[PDB]
Amino acid sequence: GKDNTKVIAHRGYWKTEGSAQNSIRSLERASEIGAYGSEFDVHLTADNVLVVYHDNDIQGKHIQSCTYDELKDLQLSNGEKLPTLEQYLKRAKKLKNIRLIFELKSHDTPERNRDAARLSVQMVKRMKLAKRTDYISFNMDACKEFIRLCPKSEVSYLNGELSPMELKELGFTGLDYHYKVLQSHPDWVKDCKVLGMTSNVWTVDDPKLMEEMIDMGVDFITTDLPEETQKILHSRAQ
Ligand SMILES: [Mg+2]
Ligand SMILES: [Mg+2]
């Protein structure tokens, strides 16, 4: 029957010429290929500036305890400067076709996670992107604050241990779980459907596994090879 699986470019479309994880180029290239969404990772600096980067440390600097001034001139793998979230969102605003899959990274206390989530929602709001921005996090305190602040927004849990029923009760609108969790709990995708929630799986790059997850009926696949997933979905729709 009909596949209902859409493609999320993990860290943007970075496995392509001139691109880099979590970059302006990767966001642009995700849009250029027509992916459903582009995922990116967000930290709050010591001085409350939101920046875009996966790892907790960049070139020996721990992002969450450093000021933005210490970090601002550090370069990505393609020579771009470390993006501010504001810069990321200014570019995303002109890219109309694409959903923004905003991962808030885990912060150092529950209260700091709440602060990072509040400031994230404020930035998304002032940049006029609340309609196109979905939140994901490993951190439960961050997720709960996004749910509280944005009851009509999409919020999915990353960490893998809560059933869809448990997530629905907390006000989540989806799960976004490691593929092995969904292999270990093969009924959770169906339960999400029954519960009116979305299912997302990360980070799936092997073609046999993409097929397995599409067969299971995941709403989204988060991948470092987004064009391969698109090809597979196109061939299957023939
Ligand atoms: Mg079919
Ligand atoms: Mg991420």
Shortest-distance ligand to the CA of residue 4: 1
DSSP strand pairing (133-137 vs 99-104): parallel
Contact 157, 176 (CB under 8 A): yes
- DSSP-assigned beta bridge partners for residue 84: 51
DSSP 100: E
Q: Can you tell me the distance from the alpha carbon of 111 to that of 184, in angstroms, rounded to the nearest whole number?
A: 33
CA of 57 to the centre of ligand 2 (A): 14
Three-state DSSP class for residue 57: strand
Amino acid at 39: E
Q: Can you tell me the distance from the alpha carbon of 138 to that of 159, in angstroms, rounded to the nearest whole number?
A: 5
Shortest-distance ligand to the CA of residue 236: 1
Helix (H) / strand (E) containing 50: strand 50-52
Rounded to the nearest 5 degrees, what angle is found at the Cα of 183, between the Cα atoms of 107 and 135? 30
CA of 55 to the centre of ligand 2 (A): 9
Three-state DSSP class for residue 193: helix
Q: Is 191 annotated as a binding residue?
A: no
Contact 5, 12 (CB under 8 A): no
Please give the full DSSP string across 75-91, using - where no structure is assigned: B-TTSPBPPBHHHHHHH
CA of 3 to the centre of ligand 1 (A): 6
DSSP strand pairing (37-44 vs 50-52): antiparallel
Residue with tokens 């698109």: 230
- DSSP-assigned beta bridge partners for residue 40: 102
Shortest-distance ligand to the CA of residue 103: 2
Q: Is 103 annotated as a binding residue?
A: yes
CA of 91 to the centre of ligand 1 (A): 37
Q: Can you tell me the distance from the alpha carbon of 149 to that of 130, in angstroms, rounded to the nearest whole number?
A: 12
Amino acid at 126: R
Could you give the C-alpha distances from 225 to 8, 86, 87, 104, 170, in angstroms and in order? 10, 26, 25, 22, 32
Q: Which is nearest to 210 in space by CA: 237, 231, 185?
A: 231
Please give the full DSSP string across 119-154, using - where no structure is assigned: HHHHHHHHTT-GGGEEEEES-HHHHHHHHHH-TTS-
Q: Can you tell me the distance from the alpha carbon of 15 to that of 2, in angstroms, rounded to the nearest whole number?
A: 29
Q: Can you tell me the distance from the alpha carbon of 228 to that of 158, in angstroms, rounded to the nearest whole number?
A: 23
Q: Can you tell me the distance from the alpha carbon of 111 to that of 160, in angstroms, rounded to the nearest whole number?
A: 22
Domain extent at residue 116: 1-238
Q: Is 70 annotated as a binding residue?
A: no
CA of 53 to the centre of ligand 2 (A): 9
CA of 230 to the centre of ligand 2 (A): 20
Q: Which is nearest to 155 in space by CA: 163, 167, 166?
A: 167
Contact 95, 133 (CB under 8 A): no
CA of 215 to the centre of ligand 1 (A): 8
Shortest-distance ligand to the CA of residue 137: 2
CA of 214 to the centre of ligand 1 (A): 9
Domain count for the chain, please give it.
1
DSSP 192: H
Helix (H) / strand (E) containing 208: helix 207-216
Sign of CA dihedral 145, 149, 151, 156: negative
C-alpha of 104 from chain center: 8
Name the resolution in angstroms.
1.9
CA of 4 to the centre of ligand 1 (A): 10
Shortest-distance ligand to the CA of residue 5: 1
- DSSP-assigned beta bridge partners for residue 156: 136, 174
Instruction: Return residues with CB closer than 5 A to ligand 1 (ion).
Output: 1
CA of 70 to the centre of ligand 2 (A): 23
Main-chain phi, psi angles of 222, to 5 degrees: -100, 120
Shortest-distance ligand to the CA of residue 216: 1
In this structure, the chain runs to a length of 238
Main-chain phi, psi angles of 40, to 5 degrees: -155, 155
Q: Can you tell me the distance from the alpha carbon of 188 to that of 164, in angstroms, rounded to the nearest whole number?
A: 6
CATH assignment at residue 94: 3.20.20.190
Amino acid at 121: V
Cis omega (within 30 of 0) for bond into 203: yes
